[PDB]
């Protein structure tokens, strides 16, 4: 009984050392740099082939192909420049809350209530997209799949366990068990050895690939965290919560830097992305619009209002050309 | 026109055509969310129909294609994956009437099921009551009083009166009476008519505001 008291005491010591080593008062620091100004994204292309609600999209590293996941049981690889459907992929489970697209462009991963992250081979002989590896071993719904490599996929799930996998064998290289609530998001680092995760227990945990243990755990949100994403430097990330706030967490400082909230916004965040320079933070709400956020000012500076339902998925290209947001409006739209 | 090996566009239109065909074929069908809680007779009803995570069961009745989303395998938070299931025609719902003690970890099959039935996305929750006794529920309500789980009950302890009180409590769970209709059915044997009952409930669902773009509802 007393050891639990000592553990709570060390938790209090950790949070007191978090507060004590910080005297920045970041509201003073933030105002120094110039504002970015009203950034009028305009819907350049509208991608009209989904007959149902869509939950995830992922971009390519060539910044021209984007995969799109939808509840009618379809993945679409979507030539973004010309609005051509390359590779409509028929799923086995129509309940897919996540989607991934390999940096090599050879593979797509998606999963959901089927508790399986299926891996699909895009570039193959015999023509059509085949399913390569069904990754079984989770028991909850799969909320996020992300490729580290053509043979390393990191998945997070609603059984409170993130797992890293070897696609060739099909078994978990690592499991990441430190979350108590259902895990709702992931983000791979730019250097691809760290990855951060967000869960329903309002705690965001950094992880390692080889170590397999949570180095750090970030709190501050009061509800589920629905979407998480690294800053492109890799030394920070931002979380999207049902709290109706977005928080910018730095790995190395170990405190929340800025909160992205306004008084008018009430609904929950659903997807988060960053610009290539990292000056502007995408954020996609249930208010039917992607209010896009200056990362440094913590000020809204533009609205990607084009959707007739809640916007579920957001993605910025790797070169920074585009932002493609899909929604239960059933249409993905690249703004620019 | 600047289209040279843009038979990519022809392939994209062909994919659009196949998508429209599949989407129309999918929206022609009926989606039911089997939301009955644990230790009920959801297994019993799915064996009564013709028939690792979500378990989707499909069946045919009177030229109408059904799909049943038995989601009992998920132990996650129900808040996160239930908004996926909006737009279902009806929610099948099992309740085990007996529990042999609710005829609160013991008397689960009344108060926990009562606690389950809360509503945030609105549709006709076709609640099926399942005795789990053939006719034996008569002798097990003779043996133990039903006032154990329901303190305010003072009606007759026979079959029909107690069953009607349980039904009345389950409808009293509902808040918005005019929006949703809770189609209630108590049957354990069910040689037929549980197929007919879900058929009639989803028929009244697809009539109302699903085939009332015309006819103005």
């Amino acid at each position, epitope marked *: 009984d007393q050891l639990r008291q000592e553990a709570e005491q060390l938790k209090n010591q950790i949070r007191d050392a978090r507060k004590a080593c910080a005297d920045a008062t970041l509201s003073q620091i933030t105002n120094n740099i110039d504002p970015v100004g009203r950034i009028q994204m305009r819907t350049r292309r509208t991608l009209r082939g989904h007959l149902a609600k869509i939950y995830a999209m992922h971009w390519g590293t060539d910044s021209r*192909l984007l995969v799109s996941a939808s509840q009618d049981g379809k993945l679409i690889i979507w030539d973004s420049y*010309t609005t051509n459907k*390359v590779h409509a992929i028929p799923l086995r489970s129509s309940w897919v809350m996540t989607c991934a697209y390999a940096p090599s462009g050879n593979y797509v991963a998606c999963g959901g209530l089927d508790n399986i992250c299926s891996i699909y081979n895009l570039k193959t002989r015999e023509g*059509n997209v085949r399913v390569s590896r069904e990754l079984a071993g989770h028991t909850g719904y799969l909320s996020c799949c992300r490729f580290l490599d053509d043979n390393q996929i990191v998945t997070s799930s609603g059984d409170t366990t993130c797992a890293l996998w070897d696609i060739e064998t099909g078994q978990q290289t690592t499991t990441f068990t430190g979350h108590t609530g259902d895990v709702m998001s992931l983000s791979l680092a730019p250097d691809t050895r760290l990855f951060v995760s967000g869960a329903c227990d309002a705690s965001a945990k950094l992880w390692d690939v080889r170590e397999g243990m949570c180095r750090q755990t970030f709190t501050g949100h009061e509800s589920d965290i629905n979407a998480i994403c690294f800053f492109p430097n890799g030394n920070a990330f931002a979380t999207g919560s049902d709290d109706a706030t977005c928080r910018l967490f730095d790995l190395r400082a170990d405190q929340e830097l800025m909160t992205y909230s306004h008084d008018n916004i009430i609904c929950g965040i659903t997807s988060v992305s960053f610009s290539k320079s990292g000056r502007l933070l995408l954020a996609g709400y249930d208010d039917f619009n992607c209010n896009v956020w200056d990362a440094l000012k913590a000020d809204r500076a533009g609205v990607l209002a084009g959707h007739d339902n809640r916007v579920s998925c957001l993605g910025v290209t790797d070169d920074g050309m585009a932002v493609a947001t899909g929604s239960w409006d059933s249409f993905l739209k690249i703004w620019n | 026109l600047s289209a*040279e*090996d843009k*038979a*990519a566009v022809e*392939r994209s239109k062909m994919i659009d055509r196949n998508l429209r065909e599949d989407g129309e074929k999918a929206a022609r069908e009926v989606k039911l969310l089997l939301l009955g809680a644990g230790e009920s007779g959801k297994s019993t009803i799915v064996k009564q129909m013709k028939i690792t995570g979500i378990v989707e069961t499909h069946f045919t009745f009177k030229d109408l294609h059904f799909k049943m989303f038995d989601v009992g395998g998920q132990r996650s938070e129900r808040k996160k994956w239930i908004h996926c299931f909006e737009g279902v025609t009806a929610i099948i719902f099992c309740v085990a009437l007996s529990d042999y003690d609710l005829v609160n970890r013991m008397h689960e099959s009344m108060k926990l099921f009562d606690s389950i039935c809360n509503n945030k996305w609105f549709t006709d929750t076709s609640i099926i009551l399942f005795l789990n006794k053939k006719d034996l529920f008569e002798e097990k309500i003779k043996k133990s009083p039903l006032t154990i789980c329901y303190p305010e009950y003072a009606g007759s302890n026979t079959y029909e009166e107690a069953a009607a009180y349980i039904q009345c409590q389950f409808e009293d769970l509902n808040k918005r009476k005019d929006t949703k209709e809770i189609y209630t059915h108590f049957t354990c044997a069910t040689d037929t008519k549980n197929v007919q009952f879900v058929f009639d409930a989803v028929t009244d669902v697809i009539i109302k505001n699903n085939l009332k773009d015309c006819g103005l509802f």
Partner: single-chain antibody
Amino acid sequence: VQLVESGGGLVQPGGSRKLSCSASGFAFSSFGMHWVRQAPEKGLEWVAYISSGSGTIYYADTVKGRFTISRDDPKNTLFLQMTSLRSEDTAMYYCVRSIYYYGSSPFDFWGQGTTLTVSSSDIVMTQATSSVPVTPGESVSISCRSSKSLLHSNGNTYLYWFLQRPGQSPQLLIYRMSNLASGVPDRFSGSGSGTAFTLTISRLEAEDVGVYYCMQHLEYPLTFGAGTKLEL
């Protein structure tokens, strides 16, 4: 992937014949089919092109309206129907997979080719030379020139490169003037400009002996160079 085709033989001039091509191993419903012919002493030249599921059909202007193409998509069988064959149709005919989307590699897989003998404004491709003498390990460059520049507004220079081994089928080496095909070694490369094209094979080895062919895909017809044959 295995494209086997039949229909070759000797036919009287003015007679009719239907070539067939039995695709066996791929999503033949999802592939554009071509046809390319080759006279026994001459180079390749295009014949026809049916799109994925007959959405768009072209023909060669030398045989426009006299040849007919037809795909049996559920049967997975490609036909070419020919009527009243002339003396210019002593040639051997190849089935050609192609598939078009962003990143795709058309003209990659070629059939075994069937031989057909009869009894008895557009782009032009210019070869560099008839032949180059060969020694293994020594780098050599093979060039073609075109009438019109091939670099479209896409940035996509529609230059292809091939190789028909002595007594074998062709294959694809460099598609769209820079990009390497799959199943071929990485020694090959392609450097191109507006109409100025070079195949920069380095570390020449055995089994690279044969005749190279260059093709344009900017517009129809598809025209082939004579190319070079690397032999001492």
